[PDB]
């Protein structure tokens, strides 16, 4: 799949693709976050 | 007042105002205002126009 991204007003999955512009496709709130996937990250309880 | 040649052109601001920041115009968007806390995690200025009623007349009349 492409990246997740999420936008912070009306949190719809935008998949930003690199040659786009950076836009929320609802709304057009232009500061989007990413999105945090599966993948394993070893921490220690200490 | 200062001097044109032979004419005298004349300004005046008769009011400005400070418009509530919104986004610029041509913009796509659905809620046109601009809060701060897109200001602090886009690192811009929240900034609002300005803008005013010059008044410009030549030789005295208000043109
Ligand atoms: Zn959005």
């Known amino acids: 799949q492409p990246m997740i991204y999420i936008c912070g007003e009306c949190h719809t999955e935008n998949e930003i693709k690199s040659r786009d512009p950076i836009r929320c496709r609802e709304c057009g709130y232009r500061i989007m ?9 070893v921490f220690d309880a200490r | 007042e200062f001097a044109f ?4 052109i ?15 115009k041509g913009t796509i968007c659905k809620e046109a205002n601009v809060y701060p806390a897109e200001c602090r995690g886009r ?3 929240y900034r609002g126009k300005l803008t005013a009623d010059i008044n410009w007349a030549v030789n005295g009349i208000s043109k």
């Not at chain 1, 976050?33 to 990250?41: D, F």
């Not at chain 2, 040649?5 to 005298?8: G, P």
Request: glycine share 0%.
């Open chain 1, 33 to 41: 976050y990413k999105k945090r996937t599966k993948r394993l990250v």
């Open chain 2, 5 to 8: 040649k032979d004419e005298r």
């Open chain 2, 43 to 45: 690192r811009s200025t």
């Open chain 2, 10 to 24: 004349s300004f005046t601001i008769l009011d400005a105002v400070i418009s509530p920041p919104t986004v610029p």
